[PDB]
Structure formats: C-alpha cells, structure tokens
Amino acid sequence: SDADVQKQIKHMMAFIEQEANEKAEEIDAKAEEEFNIEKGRLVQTQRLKIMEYYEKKEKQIEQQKKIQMSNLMNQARLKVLRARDDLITDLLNEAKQRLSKVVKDTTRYQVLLDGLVLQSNTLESRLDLIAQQMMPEVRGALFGANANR
Amino acid sequence: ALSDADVQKQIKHMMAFIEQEANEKAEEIDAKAEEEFNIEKGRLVQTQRLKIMEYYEKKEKQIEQQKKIQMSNLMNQARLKVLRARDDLITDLLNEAKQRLSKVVKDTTRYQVLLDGLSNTLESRLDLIAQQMMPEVRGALFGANANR
Amino acid sequence: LSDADVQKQIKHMMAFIEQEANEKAEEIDAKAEEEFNIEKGRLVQTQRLKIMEYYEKKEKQIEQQKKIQMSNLMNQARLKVLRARDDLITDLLNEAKQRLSKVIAGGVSNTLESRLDLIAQQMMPEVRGALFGANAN
Amino acid sequence: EMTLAQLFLQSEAAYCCVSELEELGKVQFRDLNPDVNVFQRKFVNEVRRCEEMDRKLRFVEKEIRKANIPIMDTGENPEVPFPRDMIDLEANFEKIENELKEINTNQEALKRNFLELTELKFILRKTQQFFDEMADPDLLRLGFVAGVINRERIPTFERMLWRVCRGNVFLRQAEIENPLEDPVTGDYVHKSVFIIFFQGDQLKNRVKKICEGFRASLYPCPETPQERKEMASGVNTRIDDLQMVLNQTEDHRQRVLQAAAKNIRVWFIKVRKMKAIYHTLNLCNIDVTQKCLIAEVWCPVTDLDSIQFALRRGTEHSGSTVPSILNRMQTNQTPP
Amino acid sequence: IIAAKAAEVRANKVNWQSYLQGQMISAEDCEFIQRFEMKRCSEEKQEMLQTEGSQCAKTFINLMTHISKEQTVQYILTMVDDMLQENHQRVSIFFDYAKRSKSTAWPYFLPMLNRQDPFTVHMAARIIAKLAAWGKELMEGSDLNYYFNWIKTQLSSQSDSSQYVQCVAGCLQLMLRVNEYRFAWVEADGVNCIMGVLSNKCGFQLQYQMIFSIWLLAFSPQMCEHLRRYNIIPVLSDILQESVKEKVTRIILAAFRNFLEKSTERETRQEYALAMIQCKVLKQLENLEQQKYDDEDISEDIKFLLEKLGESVQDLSSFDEYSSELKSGRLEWSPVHKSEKFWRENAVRLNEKNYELLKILTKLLEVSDDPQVLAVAAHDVGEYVRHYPRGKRVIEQLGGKQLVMNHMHHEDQQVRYNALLAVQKLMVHN
Amino acid sequence: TEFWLISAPGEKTCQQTWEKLHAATTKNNNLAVSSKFNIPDLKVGTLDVLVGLSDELAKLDAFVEGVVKKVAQYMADVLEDSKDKVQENLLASGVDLVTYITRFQWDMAKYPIKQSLKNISEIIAKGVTQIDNDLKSRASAYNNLKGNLQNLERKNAGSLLTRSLAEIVKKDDFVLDSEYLVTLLVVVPKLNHNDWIKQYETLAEMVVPRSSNVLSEDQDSYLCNVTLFKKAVDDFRHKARENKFIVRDFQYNEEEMRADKEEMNRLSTDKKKQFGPLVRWLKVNFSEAFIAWIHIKALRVFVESVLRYGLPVNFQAMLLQPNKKSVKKLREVLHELYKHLDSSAAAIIDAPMDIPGLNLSQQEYYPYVYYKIDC
Amino acid sequence: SQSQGIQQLLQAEKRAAEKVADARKRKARRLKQAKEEAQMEVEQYRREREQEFQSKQQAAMGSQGNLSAEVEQATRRQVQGMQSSQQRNRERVLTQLLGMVC
Amino acid sequence: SQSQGIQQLLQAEKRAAEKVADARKRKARRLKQAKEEAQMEVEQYRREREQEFQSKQQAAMGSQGNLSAEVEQATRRQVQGMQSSQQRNRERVLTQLLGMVCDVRP
Amino acid sequence: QSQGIQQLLQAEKRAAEKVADARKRKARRLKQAKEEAQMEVEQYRREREQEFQSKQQAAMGSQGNLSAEVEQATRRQVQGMQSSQQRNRERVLTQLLGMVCDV
C-alpha cells in the first residue's frame, strides 16, 4: 500500500545515503593517510638531495682547504730555502771581492800566479771548484749542524 | 515375323554391333598407342640431340677459337714486319752517318780538329749520341705521335 | 602304559641324539684327516717354496760371484799379457837407444833421442808385424 | 494362354524400351540374378539416388500441405527421360529443397529477433513513461534492470522479490495492452513490463537470478535520456526493417512453394516411374555375362506382336541402330 | 550401308574381257586382273603382287579410268580394299607403282572421286586415306587441298548420306592420326566444318567419328591452343549430357584429358578448365564416377579429369582471383563467388585496403545497373556477412544495408532473390 | 530446549514493542517465557556487504551448529562412562545451558565490536575451524588408544588359538637346553581327551611320559605341552591331527609375553592419564564453541534485522521459550501482532522455488526476523 | 536356340575381349619399339651434323689467303709511307746528327 | 505516485554522488596542501643549511688567514735566525775558503 | 619327573662335552702335527744347506783349478811372445836403426 511504498522508499533512501557517507569517511581517512605519506615521500627525497648537495660542497671545501694549506707550507719551505741560498751566494760574492782585492797585492799575486800556471785556472773558476766541493762544510758552519744525521 | 530366321538376323545384327564396338575400341587405343610412341620417341631423340649439339658446338667453338688466334697472329706479324722495316730504316740512317764520318775523317784539317777534341773512337761517339737522340730522330723521320 | 616300554621310545630318541653326536664326531675326524692334511700340506708347500727360492737365490748369487771372479781373472790375464808385450817393445826401443849411442845421445829439436822416438812411433805397426807375426785376421 | 519369352536388347536402348513396356504393362519381368541380394545389384546406385529424390519431393510436398497452398492435378503422365536428365532433376529438387530449408531457418531466426526487438521497444517506451514524474535534469550507485513478465505472475514475483532481497528493492510494473507473442514459447499471452531498482552488486545478482528463474527477459536499457532516445529510435527502425524483410521472405516462400505445387505431382510421377524402371533393370542380366541386356518375361501370347511393336518404339526413341529382339521358348515353369 | 555395298560388289563379279574386246584397256592389265581374280589365296596373291607390283596399280587405274561401267570400278575398289584389310602393308606395292610412274598416286584417283557411284568414290577415298596413313608419302599440295575440300563437301552433304559421311570420317581419322596432316587440317577450316556437323545433331555413328576426330586433333599442343576459338567444350559437353552410348562418353572424356594434358601453357589449361566448370562438367564427371564402367581407360580418364577440374576450381577460389575480378568488375558468378572454403577462409581479407573491397562492393551495388553485376555484388555482400559477423556493423557503416534493402524490390527477379538472401543473412543477429 | 529469537522492529522505541511482546503477552496467557536479548550496536556497513553477510551468517550458523553437536557427540562418547546429565557437563557457564542463554550477553573480549562485521565474523570462523580440527585429531587419537585397549581385550577373548596364550602357557614345562628335544602343544577338543594320559605319554614314537603336562582345561577343550625329539616336530603335529587336535604353536614367546603385559599396563595407564586431559579439553572447548555459536546467532539476528528495517537501528529482539504445545497459538498471535510491524502485502501466503542462481530461500519467512536455538 | 543364342553372344564377347587384348599387347610391345627405334634417329642426327662439320672444316681454309693478301697490301702501303717520309727528312737529320757529334 | 518513488530515488542518488564528489575534492585539496607543506619544510631546511654553509665558509676564511699570518711569522723568524747564525761564522768560513783557494799546491 | 629329566640332562652335558674335548684335542693335534712337519722340513733344509755349502766350497776349488789354468795360459802366451820376438829382433833392430840413419 501507499504505506508500503513510503516504507520501501525510506529504506532504500537511508541505505544509499549511508553507503555514500561510509564512502566519504573512508575517503577522508585514506586522504589523511595520503597526506602523511606524501609529506614523507617528498620531504625525504628533497632533503636527501639537499643533504647530498651540501655535503658534496663541504667535502670540496675541505679538499680546497687541505690543498691551500699544503701549498702554503710548501711555499714557506721553499722561501726559507731561497733565503738560505741567497745567504750562501752572498758569501760567495764576498769571497770573489776578496780575491779581486788580493790580486791587487803584487807580492801575493805573483806567488799565486806562479802557482796557478805551474798547476781554465782562472780564480773565478778555482773559487767555484773549491766551493762546490766545500758546500757541506760551509752549510755546517753557517747554519749549524743537523741533529737528525 | 518372329521366325527363327528373324531371330538369327537380329542376333547377327547384335554380333555385328559388338564387332563394331570392339573394332572402334581397337582403333581408339591404337591411335593412343601411336601418339604415345611418337611423344616418347621425340623425348628420347631430344635428350640425345642435347648431347650431340653440346659435343659438336664445343668442337665448332674450338674451330672458331683457332680462326681467331690465326687472324690475331697474322695481324701481329704485319705489325712486327712494319716495325722491322722502320728499324732497318733507322739502321740505314746510322750507317750513312758512320760512312759520312769516315769520309770526313780523311779531311786532314777536320780530322786534326776532331782529334784535338777527342773509348772515344768516332764509332763509340756515334752510338752514344744516337742512343740519346733517337726521340728526335723519330720525330724528324716519321712525324711525331699525334696521341702524345 | 608302563615305564619299561616307554623306556623303549625314550632310548630310541636317546639313540637319535647319540647318532647325531657320532655323526659330529666322525665330522671331527674327517676334519682331522682331510683339513689337517690340507693345512699341513699348505704349510709344507709354503715352507718348501720359500726355502727353495732362498736356496736358489743363494746358489745363483754364488754362481754369479764365481762368474764375476772368473771374468776379472780373465781380464787381468789379458791386461797382464798386454803389459808383457808392451814391455818387450819398450825393451826393444831401449836397446835401440843403447845402440844409437854407440854409433843426451847427440844430434842438434833433432837430437838422436827425438828422432828415434819420432821414427819408432811411426814404425810401430811394422815392428809389431815383424816381431809377433801378422794378425791372421 | 501365357508364355515365357526373353529379350536381347542393347544397354543403350534398354532403359527406354523397358519404359515403353511399363507403359504397355502386358509384360511381367522376373529376377534373373537372385544369387546376389537386391541391396547389392548393379543399378542399385541409381535406385538409391532415385529414392533420395523421392524423399526430397515428399519433404517439399509436406511443406505444401503445411501451408495453405493447393496441389495441382493435370493428368499428364510423362516418362522419365532415359538420358541423364537425372542431373537436371537433381539440381532442380536440390534447389527446391535448399531454398525452402534456408527460408524456413531464416524465417524462424528473424521471427525470434523481431519479437525480441518488439519486447525491447515496449520496455523502452514504458521506462520512458516511468521516468516522467519530473525530469528536470537532462541526464551511479543505483543499479537498474528491466524486463517483461507474464501477467498474473506479478503477485508471486513481487512477493518473491520482497522476500529474497528483503525490503531493499523497488519494482514498478505496467500492463502491456495488445498482448504479445512469447519469444520462444510461442503463444499470445498478456505481459507486464517491469523496472527494478536495487542498491549494489549482491542485490543485482539476487534479482538477476530471480528473474531468470521466473522465465523473464531483461535486455539492456538506457542510462541517460539521450541514450534512451537513441536506442529507442534505433530499435524502432530495426523493427520496421525486420518487418519488411520478414514480409518479403514470406512472399518468397509463398512464390517458390506455389511454383512447386504447380509441378509437384508431375515430379512425383516422373521420379517414381524412373525408380521403378531402374529397379526393374536390376532384375535383368548384366555385363557380367554380356554387354547386351537379357530380359526374361511372362506375357500372354496374343500381345507378343504389340510388345515387339512397343520395343520398336524404344529403339527409335533411343536412337540405337541395333534393334532389340524378342524370342519365345518352350518351357516347364508354371504360367501365372 | 558401306559393308552391304562391299558385299554386293564382291558377289557381283563382271568379266574384264569385255573391255579388252573393246580395246578400252591394255591386254596386260586384263591378264593381270584375271590372274589376281583367279589368285585368291594369300600366297598366290602375294606372289602375284611381288612379281607384278607395278603392273597391278597400272592395270587397276587403266580399267577404272577408261571403263565407264560402275561395276568394274566397284569390283576393283573392293578388291583393293580387301587387299588392304587383309594386310594393310600391301599399300607399299601401290606406292612402288607411283614410284615407277614417277608421279604421285593421288592424281590417278583425285578425278575418280567425282565418279557417279557414291560407293566407288567412298572406296577410292578410303584407299587414298589408307595409302597416305601407312605410307611414307605425306600428301600435300593442290591435290591435298582438293582432297580435303572433297571431304569437306561430303561432310557438307549432311541415312545413306550419313553412311557415306561415316566413310569420309574414317578417312579423316586415318589422316589426322599422322602429325603433319593434323596441322594441314587445322590450317584449313575443317574444325569449323566438324563443329557445324556436330551442330546438325548427326547420327550416333557420325557423332562418334567426329568426337574421335576432335580427340586426335587435341593430341598436338599447337592444335589444342589454336582450336580454342571454336569453343568446342560447350558443344561437346552438351552432347555428352544428351547422349549415353559408352563410346561417345569414352571419346569425349579422352578428348577432355587430351585438352587438359597437352595444352601448351598453364593459361590455356586454366581457360579450358574454366570453360568446363562454367559449363557444369564437374557435376557430370562426378556422376559418371558414381557410375561404374568396365575398362580402366574410362575410369582413369574420369579420375584425371576430376582431379584437374578440382585443382582448377581451387586455383580460381584464390582470394587474388576475387580481388582482381572486383577490380575489373568481373562479377559474373565465377566459381569463387560460391566457394564455401573461399568465403569461410578469406572473408576477413575483404577488410583489406582499409575496407577497400567493401567500398568497391558498395559502389557497385549503388551504381551498377546490369542485373547480373548487382546480383553478384549482393550475394558477395551476403557471403561476407555470413562468414564473418564482425563486418555487419562495417556494412551498416557503409550504408550497404540501405542499398541491399533498396535492391530487394529491384526490377530484376534475379537481382531480387540475391538481395533477399543477403538481407536475411545480414539481419540474422542483432 | 527450543528458543525463538524474534526481531520486533522497535515500533519507535524499546518500550512500545518490547513491553507489549513480553508483559502483555504473559498477562494474556503464559504461552511462552519472554526475555530481552540486548544486542550490542555493532558497526553497520554498506548494504552490499550487509547482504553478503546475510548469506555468510546463513552458512556459518549451520557450520557452527555442526561443530558444537560434534563436540556434544565426542563428550557423549569419551564421557560414556558417566554420560548421565550430559547437558550439565556441557554448559558454557552458569548452572545450565538454558540459564546461560537466557542471560546471554555479548563478550567484547571474544570479539571487538568496533571491528567491521565481516571481520567480526572471521574472528568466530577461525576459532571454530581450529575447534573442528582439534575435535578431529585429539578425539581420534584417544579413540585409537581405546581401540588398542579393545584389541588387547579381543586378544584376551576367543579360544586359545584365536587368542594369544601368553601368560596362559606354563613356562615350567618348557625344556631347557632344548637343542635336539622340544615341546609341542597341539591339543584342543575334550571329546577326544578320553585317553589323553596315554596319548601324551605316547603321542609320538619317542615322546617323554613325565615332562608332558596340561596347562589349561576348558569345558570343551584342554591345552597341554608334550615333549618330543627335534626331528619329531611335524610328525607330532601329524599325530595331533590324527587325534583330531588343532594347531597350538607357541614358540615359547615368554619374553614377548612379558613385553605384551607391560604394553597393556602402559596403555591402560595412558588411558587413565589422558581421559582426564581430553575430558577437560572438551569441557573447556564446549563453552567456547557454544559462545561462538550464540555469537553467530546474534550476528545473524542483527544483520537480518537491519536489512529488514532501514537505518537507524531498532532491534529490541525478544527471546521466547515456547511452552508445552503452545507453538501454534503463540505463532498465530505473533503473526497477528506483527502484521503491522512488517508488510502484510507480500509473502505470507506462499511462494514458488527459485533454486537457480546464487542463493535460494532456505527457511520459512515470517513477519519478523526469527531464529532458533535448539539446545 | 536361346541357349545357342546366348552362347553365340558370349563367344562374340570373348572375340571382342581377344581383340582388345591384342590391341593392348600391341601397345605394350610397341612401347619397347619406341625405346629402341630412337637409335636410328639419333644416328641420323649425328651423321648429319658430322657431314656439316666436316664440310665446314674443309671449306673454311679459303679465307686465309684473302686475309693474307689484304694485310700484306696494307703493310706494303705502310712501309711505302714510312720509306717516303724518311727519304723526305733524311738529309737534315743527318746534318744535325753529324753537327752534334762533331 | 508510481513515479514519485522513482523521483525520490534519483534525487537520493544525486545527493550521494555530490557527497562523494565533495570528499574527493577534499582529498585532492589536502593532497595539494601536503605537497605545499612538504615544499615549505624543504625550503626551511635548505635555508638552514645555507646559513650553516656560510658560517663554515666564514670560519674557514678566518682560519686560513690566521694560518697564513702564523706561517709567515714563522718563516720570518726562521730567516732571522739563519741570518744571525751566519753572521757569527761568516769570517771563519770566508777565511777558510780563501785560504784553500790561495794555497795551490801544484 | 625331575630325576628322569636329570638323567637326560647328564646325557646332553656329556653330548656337548665330547665335541668340546674333540675340538680341544683337535687344536692340540694340529699344533703338534704342524710342529713335527715343520721340524722335519727344517732338518731337511738344514741338511740341504750344509750339503750346498760343502758343494759350493768344493766347486770353488774346482774353478780355482781353471783359475790356475788361466794363469798357465797367460804364461804360455808370454813365452810365445818372447820367442816370437827373439826370432825377428835382429832384423827389426837393423832395419829401424838403418832407416834412422837414412836422412
């Protein structure tokens, strides 16, 4: 009867609406899940890439600092060596001037020349020859011995 | 009438018709046999004709090759003969040259001059000079080669 | 039934047992004959074989020992006679040196000693042939 | 006064000659090869095909009776042509059978499709009628089916629906005036077109199986009024097309059957005589003894000449130069 | 009537001394004729021929030409025919006579064919034919052409006329048996004359002889290729269906075997096979195979003809044939249009070229006005629907449903039936 | 007992329908004892899955009925010694099963209400399946032990040849060092024992007269051992056939006799130790299976009651215990009173079969949800 | 006689069977003649081609003389041309050559 | 009447379709919001580490400057010490070298 | 009874003991016979060894006889060598010295 029609209408209405609401609630819950997992995925990936980038640049910076330090110390070492060499060469030129002085003394230069002749015997050569052989003794005498030897 | 004479005549007609049928079968089969014989004979004769033709065309090809080689050889002998005629020409020329040099060698003044200049026997000079001048001698005796 | 007659079947069974025991005893005696002879013969064959092999090895070692001593005796005979021959040859050359001095010995390296040695070392085959006869072979 | 006789007759003319006899009817043949059973004899092949031809005619004749068409009666009695007119008759009857069978099958299938499509048309029209409270929108959870039921099953069917898929399915029904013919059961019965609405898959299966059990028919239905109009127009055109084709094929059947009834009796007489003649030549001697057929016969004496005369006709009709020959013979066997 | 004439001539002996009395013949000819007539034994006849080989034909020719009486001519012709029949080799002697006369033997008898007595002319023709067939002389030249023309005239005569035509046909069979005379008769219009003689529906004997003539002429491949212009196959098949004598069927079947085996090219073979099939020889051959015969010749011929015809039908059924025909508008009920295997196995190929075949069919069904073409197109469309339901929508897509429905009420009943079948096939299922 | 659970769709409230069903029904006449069911508000789902369940809880009620009755059968068998008051030994709780059911309350601990209906069903299903397998296995093993005992008894039954003599034979009569002598026992019928004294002393041709002796003597037959030589075995048996005796081979299985006695003692002790365990297991498992069954009854009630009455829910179901032969009157009264709560425009009268398809109606349809408990 | 007539027909059929059998035997035997007689034709072919070949070989000798005469005339023309060309230019080549050698 | 129920049914179906479409829109919107929030957090971390990188660079520059100054001072001290040592032995070594040269010993 | 059973138990004990003693005496007899055969073989072998040693010693002297003969053969060959030399010594020396002086 008309009551029957209304009753069936109400029943199907209620159940279709409740099916809709149940779907809506399930969608909302899965949506919160998707919200969480999407934050997780995107943050994880982008953070990983950013960490990689920053860490790589930091490693490059540390390598640059190491190389810069190595160069600085090497230049310090070579500079002290060049100072030492300049000192020793100054000694040699002092010796050369001394020779040029003594040659003026005829009394001494006569004997010295007799000797050389009796022995490229230019003083500019003999001084070089003796000094290159004496280098160890001059090093030891000017700059103190080496303890580690 | 259906008398024994009529029956005999009708059976005789039957005999004649069966004879005709047999005769026609024999004629047909005989013609088929003849055509089969002809085609088989033609097939076999063709197969043998193949071999005969191959053999005798090989022989004729050898004869043609001999003809060609003979003609080529004859042309070659023509060419070599004309070349030999030219070469004999050149040698006659050189011989005239040596004879002329001999005739000069008597002229005392020229002989003295040439000796003053001069294995330097005039013959040696002539062979040496000729073996180098040959290109000009050819150019001047038989015209240049238009293809050059 | 009675004990006397039943003793009959009892004794028949006991005779069955005693006959089985006699069969076993005859088996033991057959062992002591056949297997005992087989074992003694195996032992005898083994002992005799080993002992005779050892005897033959000893005998062959004795015969080889005698063969070696005889071979060395023959060879030393041969080399002794060769030395005897060579000693004769040396005596001949020494006599030649003794006679040459009659004719260092002398000379001028052409000393008579050097010459004589050099000639004799070439004559040898001829000296051998002349003195000890040509080799028939 | 009866007498045996025997005929020598060339095979080529033999058929025609025995035919002339059959028309004459004053001759009684006898088996001359009883040694081999009838079902094995020489001409059996022919007789077999003859029988088959006869069957064909019977079948067509039967359809002739099934329809209202009458069967003529001329009175002519032509003779089967001795030459191989059998091939021509075989082709003719093969056509007059194959056409009739194809027409019958296509008529059946097309009637079925026409009825199904008419049901679909009525369903569409009534569903359109139901979707006419107020269709304000022009155009998915709800599942929807529709079909047709036999009237007076609405009470039981409605009860079953409300009892299985308890209180969760909606059904609307509408009588179909001008009752229709059943798709398969083939009877003019009243029908009601019904639309059922249901929630989800499980109830869909419930109602589908219920209707199938109630020997109903569903067919698809539109989902949108545009689809409804589209498919309604398509079905309305296809129904008329089917009506035209059905009328034309039925006219075709009527015409070929009329043509058949014009000559079915003469066809029967031809093929029957031809069967009888070949069955008779079975009774005569065969090439196992001679290329000329041998016949043995009872005849009354006085008709002999006539028989010979009849034989002559056969020769002339057969065109064989050789004549057939009739010979008497003194005999012992009993005359009939 | 030929045999009866021969028997009457043999019985009716006429004295040859009357001609000698009139000085119309040479005495030697009369003496030789008398000796031969008295010498009937095989040994006696052979000895007389060997001793008087040249004299025999000379005397016969002299008596036949000089004597106006038909009795002597008939007797001489009968004697010569008897000599040839007892031993066909005797021909050589006559040739020797022509060799002795330094002339062809045809001229001595060619005018004889114009003699009054039909029996005499036919006997002379038979003698000439046998002499040609068994000899080394290939008849040629104006005499050969005139002889062929005389045979043609005798054939045009077409029953005593039928009986004489039988002798003419026997001579024709004897001549055609040779290879060269085959081309000789082919070059002449004899093929047309023979086909016409068949058209007259001659007697059984004439029918057999003519069929044999065709069977012989079919042997040489060139003749088989050349004769196609006369389209014998239809007339021969009509005779085969009409007539029943075992001789006619055997000869015609052998003729078909020769035509289908001796053809020069596969193209001619396909042409002959199509001519047979469209003439419905396949069904007749099948029925004949159903029947039983005696000789292995007929059975083997039937089997071979059936095999070749079936292979040709299969070749015609190839979808390439259908596509070529559709491209050429050859919708004339070819074997493919009804081949059940063809449709069942290649209806899908109709989709080829982006519905090109279906478009062609639709265009033909829309424009074609020739009843045969329209009906063929409709039956093809129905076959396409029947053998592949998937195309139904495609047909409806092309509108072919509308065209077929329209053609259903077409003016030509032949088109109407095919259209009805196609429509019923199309509307079989939704 | 028979209990009928009736849906009673509320009628807008618990009072309006439950009161009329119980108090008014009792006041008009004590036709049946009324009680409230008090179903919990489970989590109703979609109508598709709800119908799927109204089929699953059609199947499972029968399956669990079968399992519980199988448990009842096992308790009737294994407890066959004291099967008196079998029902009381089965009660899940309370004093008796009837009391348990009338006071039934859903146990959330057994199954979680907050779960979904399919899951709540699976929870009962798994447990019941395990119960079924356990009843198949453990009861079968106890039956196997009882059958071993029965086979031992059967060995104790029958004649001496059919039975195993074992302890029956006297070991004192056995011949020690029985190398060439033995003892053969072939003696049965007492009808042929009229001269047994001489036969035993002379059964064979070398039989001992002293050692041979009788061990047992039945009313119809006698059993004894007689000494003979090693070779007199078969002949002795032959002689035994001569005196109409039966084969009584023993093979002096004294050690086997001791072993068999020990095995019988161990089997009896194992039965005593295991019946208590299996009986306890059945007593405890019956409570659980019955609880799961009543839970499935409740689930079926709720599923069918929602389906029949659209959401929201109202299922103050009444449990009625029918009186003596009051079924017809009570059912008619319920139908009359339920003509309104449910549609009277359908069903009720009759219906044809609809067997083809996924499901066909299996029970009678009534103008309410109706279910049975058949304790 | 009916038995006599039937026997007559059967004897005639036997005669026809003999006739067809004789024709078949002729065919079968003449197949071997087909195999054998081909020797005559192949021999005639061989002899014909041999005759033609030998005739060609014997007659081919002629062209040699004509070819020789033609080419010899050609070389004679060439040599006369070379000889004339030399005789024209000879003197100046000689005078140059001597001038250079001296 | 017979159609009124159908009207109600279709209207209810549309209500359900709308109420599920709304939830779908909410899901899509919240997914986009999640994407945005993740990106904003990524930006926060990126700028945090940029700041840290800048601090590290500043510290490295300062350390390098300090180290350069220290090592330069060390080298200057070394050179000064070398000069002071040499000034003490200049005359002795010089005399030794000059003497070795002047004494020839042919 | 018990006495009757014991009368046969004694018989069985004796039936076993006879075979036991048979086996024991068989072992003893095998040992004794093997010892006696071994002693016989060993005495025979020792006698053979003594005979072999004596025979080998005697054959040692026998071959020493051939050793002395080989010595005598050496002596004969040496004497032959000396005589053959003596025969031709003079002529060999004369020729050798003569061709030495021939320079």
PDB file of N, CA and C in Angstrom, chain D residues 201-227:
ATOM      1  N   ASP D 201      26.017  -4.665  -5.934  1.00  0.00           N
ATOM      2  CA  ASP D 201      26.270  -5.849  -6.749  1.00  0.00           C
ATOM      3  C   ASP D 201      25.537  -7.072  -6.220  1.00  0.00           C
ATOM      4  N   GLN D 202      25.570  -7.300  -4.910  1.00  0.00           N
ATOM      5  CA  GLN D 202      24.953  -8.510  -4.386  1.00  0.00           C
ATOM      6  C   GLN D 202      23.466  -8.544  -4.707  1.00  0.00           C
ATOM      7  N   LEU D 203      22.769  -7.440  -4.475  1.00  0.00           N
ATOM      8  CA  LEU D 203      21.356  -7.426  -4.813  1.00  0.00           C
ATOM      9  C   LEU D 203      21.148  -7.523  -6.316  1.00  0.00           C
ATOM     10  N   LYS D 204      22.057  -6.954  -7.108  1.00  0.00           N
ATOM     11  CA  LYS D 204      21.959  -7.111  -8.553  1.00  0.00           C
ATOM     12  C   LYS D 204      21.928  -8.581  -8.924  1.00  0.00           C
ATOM     13  N   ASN D 205      22.872  -9.353  -8.393  1.00  0.00           N
ATOM     14  CA  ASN D 205      22.888 -10.780  -8.684  1.00  0.00           C
ATOM     15  C   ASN D 205      21.624 -11.457  -8.180  1.00  0.00           C
ATOM     16  N   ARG D 206      21.167 -11.099  -6.982  1.00  0.00           N
ATOM     17  CA  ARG D 206      19.940 -11.701  -6.474  1.00  0.00           C
ATOM     18  C   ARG D 206      18.801 -11.525  -7.461  1.00  0.00           C
ATOM     19  N   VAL D 207      18.544 -10.284  -7.876  1.00  0.00           N
ATOM     20  CA  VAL D 207      17.382 -10.034  -8.720  1.00  0.00           C
ATOM     21  C   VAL D 207      17.583 -10.627 -10.102  1.00  0.00           C
ATOM     22  N   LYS D 208      18.805 -10.574 -10.627  1.00  0.00           N
ATOM     23  CA  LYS D 208      19.040 -11.152 -11.939  1.00  0.00           C
ATOM     24  C   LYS D 208      18.700 -12.635 -11.937  1.00  0.00           C
ATOM     25  N   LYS D 209      19.192 -13.368 -10.940  1.00  0.00           N
ATOM     26  CA  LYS D 209      18.893 -14.793 -10.894  1.00  0.00           C
ATOM     27  C   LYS D 209      17.421 -15.043 -10.613  1.00  0.00           C
ATOM     28  N   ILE D 210      16.787 -14.208  -9.792  1.00  0.00           N
ATOM     29  CA  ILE D 210      15.360 -14.389  -9.547  1.00  0.00           C
ATOM     30  C   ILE D 210      14.583 -14.265 -10.850  1.00  0.00           C
ATOM     31  N   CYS D 211      14.827 -13.193 -11.604  1.00  0.00           N
ATOM     32  CA  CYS D 211      14.101 -13.014 -12.856  1.00  0.00           C
ATOM     33  C   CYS D 211      14.366 -14.169 -13.804  1.00  0.00           C
ATOM     34  N   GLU D 212      15.632 -14.560 -13.956  1.00  0.00           N
ATOM     35  CA  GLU D 212      15.931 -15.697 -14.815  1.00  0.00           C
ATOM     36  C   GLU D 212      15.143 -16.924 -14.377  1.00  0.00           C
ATOM     37  N   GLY D 213      15.007 -17.125 -13.067  1.00  0.00           N
ATOM     38  CA  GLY D 213      14.216 -18.241 -12.580  1.00  0.00           C
ATOM     39  C   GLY D 213      12.744 -18.089 -12.901  1.00  0.00           C
ATOM     40  N   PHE D 214      12.254 -16.857 -12.909  1.00  0.00           N
ATOM     41  CA  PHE D 214      10.870 -16.569 -13.256  1.00  0.00           C
ATOM     42  C   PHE D 214      10.637 -16.526 -14.764  1.00  0.00           C
ATOM     43  N   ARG D 215      11.543 -17.112 -15.549  1.00  0.00           N
ATOM     44  CA  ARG D 215      11.493 -17.124 -17.013  1.00  0.00           C
ATOM     45  C   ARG D 215      11.008 -15.786 -17.562  1.00  0.00           C
ATOM     46  N   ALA D 216      11.751 -14.746 -17.216  1.00  0.00           N
ATOM     47  CA  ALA D 216      11.541 -13.415 -17.749  1.00  0.00           C
ATOM     48  C   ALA D 216      12.654 -13.082 -18.732  1.00  0.00           C
ATOM     49  N   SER D 217      12.530 -11.928 -19.374  1.00  0.00           N
ATOM     50  CA  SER D 217      13.539 -11.447 -20.305  1.00  0.00           C
ATOM     51  C   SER D 217      13.871 -10.013 -19.944  1.00  0.00           C
ATOM     52  N   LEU D 218      15.165  -9.694 -19.912  1.00  0.00           N
ATOM     53  CA  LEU D 218      15.638  -8.409 -19.414  1.00  0.00           C
ATOM     54  C   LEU D 218      16.041  -7.453 -20.535  1.00  0.00           C
ATOM     55  N   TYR D 219      17.031  -7.837 -21.335  1.00  0.00           N
ATOM     56  CA  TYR D 219      17.646  -6.951 -22.313  1.00  0.00           C
ATOM     57  C   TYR D 219      18.272  -5.747 -21.627  1.00  0.00           C
ATOM     58  N   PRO D 220      19.183  -5.042 -22.289  1.00  0.00           N
ATOM     59  CA  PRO D 220      19.723  -3.813 -21.709  1.00  0.00           C
ATOM     60  C   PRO D 220      18.666  -2.726 -21.670  1.00  0.00           C
ATOM     61  N   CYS D 221      19.086  -1.566 -21.198  1.00  0.00           N
ATOM     62  CA  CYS D 221      18.248  -0.383 -21.139  1.00  0.00           C
ATOM     63  C   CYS D 221      19.151   0.834 -21.067  1.00  0.00           C
ATOM     64  N   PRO D 222      18.625   2.013 -21.367  1.00  0.00           N
ATOM     65  CA  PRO D 222      19.462   3.209 -21.361  1.00  0.00           C
ATOM     66  C   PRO D 222      19.817   3.620 -19.943  1.00  0.00           C
ATOM     67  N   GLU D 223      20.868   4.428 -19.842  1.00  0.00           N
ATOM     68  CA  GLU D 223      21.243   5.036 -18.576  1.00  0.00           C
ATOM     69  C   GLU D 223      20.955   6.526 -18.540  1.00  0.00           C
ATOM     70  N   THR D 224      20.863   7.164 -19.697  1.00  0.00           N
ATOM     71  CA  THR D 224      20.563   8.580 -19.822  1.00  0.00           C
ATOM     72  C   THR D 224      19.436   8.763 -20.823  1.00  0.00           C
ATOM     73  N   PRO D 225      18.606   9.790 -20.647  1.00  0.00           N
ATOM     74  CA  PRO D 225      17.526  10.014 -21.620  1.00  0.00           C
ATOM     75  C   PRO D 225      18.027  10.168 -23.039  1.00  0.00           C
ATOM     76  N   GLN D 226      19.219  10.730 -23.233  1.00  0.00           N
ATOM     77  CA  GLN D 226      19.806  10.748 -24.567  1.00  0.00           C
ATOM     78  C   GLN D 226      20.015   9.329 -25.074  1.00  0.00           C
ATOM     79  N   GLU D 227      20.578   8.464 -24.227  1.00  0.00           N
ATOM     80  CA  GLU D 227      20.754   7.068 -24.607  1.00  0.00           C
ATOM     81  C   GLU D 227      19.409   6.395 -24.843  1.00  0.00           C
TER      82      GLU D 227
END
